[PDB]
Amino acid sequence: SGFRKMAFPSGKVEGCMVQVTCGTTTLNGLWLDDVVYCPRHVICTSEDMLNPNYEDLLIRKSNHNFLVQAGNVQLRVIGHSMQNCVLKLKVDTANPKTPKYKFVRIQPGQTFSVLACYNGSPSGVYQCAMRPNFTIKGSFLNGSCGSVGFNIDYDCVSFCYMHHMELPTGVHAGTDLEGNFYGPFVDRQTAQAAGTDTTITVNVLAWLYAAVINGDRWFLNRFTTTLNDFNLVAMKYNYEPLTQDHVDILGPLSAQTGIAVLDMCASLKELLQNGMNGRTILGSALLEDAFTPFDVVAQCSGV
Amino acid sequence: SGFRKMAFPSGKVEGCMVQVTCGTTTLNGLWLDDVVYCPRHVICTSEDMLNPNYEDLLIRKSNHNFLVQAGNVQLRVIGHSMQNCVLKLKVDTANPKTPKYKFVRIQPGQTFSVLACYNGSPSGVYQCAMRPNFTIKGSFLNGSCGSVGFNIDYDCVSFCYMHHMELPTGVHAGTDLEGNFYGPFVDRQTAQAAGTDTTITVNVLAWLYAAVINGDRWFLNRFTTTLNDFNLVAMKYNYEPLTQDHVDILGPLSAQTGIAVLDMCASLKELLQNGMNGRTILGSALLEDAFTPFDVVAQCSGV
Ligand SMILES: *[C@H](O)[C@H](C[C@@H]1CCNC1=O)NC(=O)[C@H](CC(C)C)NC(=O)OCc1ccccc1
Ligand SMILES: *[C@H](O)[C@H](C[C@@H]1CCNC1=O)NC(=O)[C@H](CC(C)C)NC(=O)OCc1ccccc1
Secondary structure: OOOOOOOOOOHHHHOOEEEEEEOOEEEEEEEEOOEEEEEHHHHOOOHHHHOOOHHHHHHOOOHHHOEEEEOOEEEOEEEEEEEOOEEEEEEOOOOOOOOOEEEOOOOOOOEEEEEEEEOOEEEEEEEEEOOOOOOEOOOOOOOOOOOEEEEEEOOEEEEEEEEEEEOOOOOEEEEOOOOOEOOOOOOOOOOOOOOOOOEOHHHHHHHHHHHHHOOOOOOOOOOOOOHHHHHHHHHHHOEOOOOHHHHHHOHHHHHHHOOOHHHHHHHHHHHHHHOOOOOOEOOEOOOOOOOOHHHHHHHHOOO | OOOOOOOOOOHHHHOOEEEEEEOOEEEEEEEEOOEEEEEHHHHOOOHHHHOOOHHHHHHOOOHHHOEEEEOOEEEOEEEEEEEOOEEEEEEOOOOOOOOOEEEOOOOOOOEEEEEEEEOOEEEEEEEEEOOOOOOEOOOOOOOOOOOEEEEEEOOEEEEEEEEEEEOOOOOEEEEOOOOOEOOOOOOOOOOOOOOOOOEOHHHHHHHHHHHHHOOOOOOOOOOOOOHHHHHHHHHHHOEOOOOHHHHHHOHHHHHHHOOOHHHHHHHHHHHHHHOOOOOOEOOEOOOOOOOOHHHHHHHHOOO
């Protein structure tokens, strides 16, 4: 038993990270087959990052302006193109460690693992949730751009995130691997604001089931409620409304514990109105929404 | 002069539309080079559309189950793969009418042209705006899926939308050309709800400039306001808050008319609080948010 925020093993991705330098700007790239993907602002100097015209910037470069290193080995760039906010560099060597992979775009509320890298070298791995306002709460310093987010299904790596920027509030924003931003952001060094964030209700319920499976039962009661009565309370506290599809997704957890979803909603309703009164759930004094129902099933189905 | 909702000329796209049939299900496909892109629910029967398992459905098909027609010519399918919610069919013939093209994902508030098609045959063309809740207000009947949305920049067609479904409220939802949905929808025939829609403020201001350029000036006054004072009124009426970037985007229109952006906001503030009192602007009795500042510049800069 036990319940921990955990990331996928990063081995398959570590073999794909390279260092990309253009001028005095260095960041990370993702090397799959004979292509290196990286944020397009690698072609910027500092004066350029306030209002870059990327099309002008790119036409003034040639292949030999791009320094790509895979550890010690230097990769020869033989072509380059821009695809939305990512640069695609054709190199002369296919990465022999290329895993089975796909490019997917995730939805708010879903989780993924981030492999933080600096200078082409993996540094740490952690799980993030895509927030309803299309930001993530990461840990990123200068030089981290081009670090990627991913999930592992079967033997296949699904890449879903590439890191580009930090917003003034300390949260992080980036693109999918086709170069399209999550959220209404642009890759310019100007002050941008994210929308209001909300709490992911289906995730909170999944985490309350995890708590019950691990022996934290103090917040349960015999009450029940209806979807409508719950959703009217939820929207007062900035919680996402709950759909019938969410109830269905929680099925396996309701079956394993014998506690119906609408019963758990009544417990959540009480915690929202009364608070937790110095009590904790799974070691937290706050309601956690960072775990999907699938994350919970993966750690709790064996209990 | 004059101001009309207009679509891009559709010629370059008309040459790319084909008919795709699998079983008794027929819809449209987009034929670029030697690939035909179409919604993956073409592989569904009716019993399948309530809860399809697309991976199971696809493994039970072979290339010869797919009938692709380009007018009279039958195209031979020699491979197939699934990419998120789109099917990619490799055919034996490259489309000789393939334009210069790219796949882009648009943001809420942006506009694009829809070429509505049935049985691989273009039927009509109209402009749409992507709503803040990731739906579009289209006109689509059975058989329209696989119709595409696009913009024309220079000589290049930017495809941004492929049509998949109608929601219970009569609005429409679909994917980008990589198969990733706009909004939190799935390609299942179940009741799904879109989020609350809001009014796109920068677009309304652009349209008020269009009105002034065309001689509709009755709503102007000498007042001015600040961004903060405006945004506090705007959020009471379900308008998107206005950013400094929006003010900058309106620059060319403020210059052409000599009316500062914050001056126009004061006029908008008054129309929101007082209404229009049976008066019209550009032939409408409502405030229109379907035109971007770039749409307005394109029709009004010559005036
Ligand atoms: C790329 O490595 C870098 C990642 C930033 C650095 C601090 N934390 C991050 O996530 N990105 C940028 O510097 C980015 C480049 C623009 C052309 C998009 N700008 C950015 O994030 O500016 C805000 C900021 C910069 C430095 C420290 C804190 C915030
Ligand atoms: C594809 O041609 C079709 C387009 C619909 C038909 C009515 N207007 C449209 O935009 N799509 C579907 O039938 C779609 C298929 C699922 C597997 C995603 N389901 C759908 O839109 O169901 C709602 C609906 C169906 C028929 C009429 C009105 C609404």
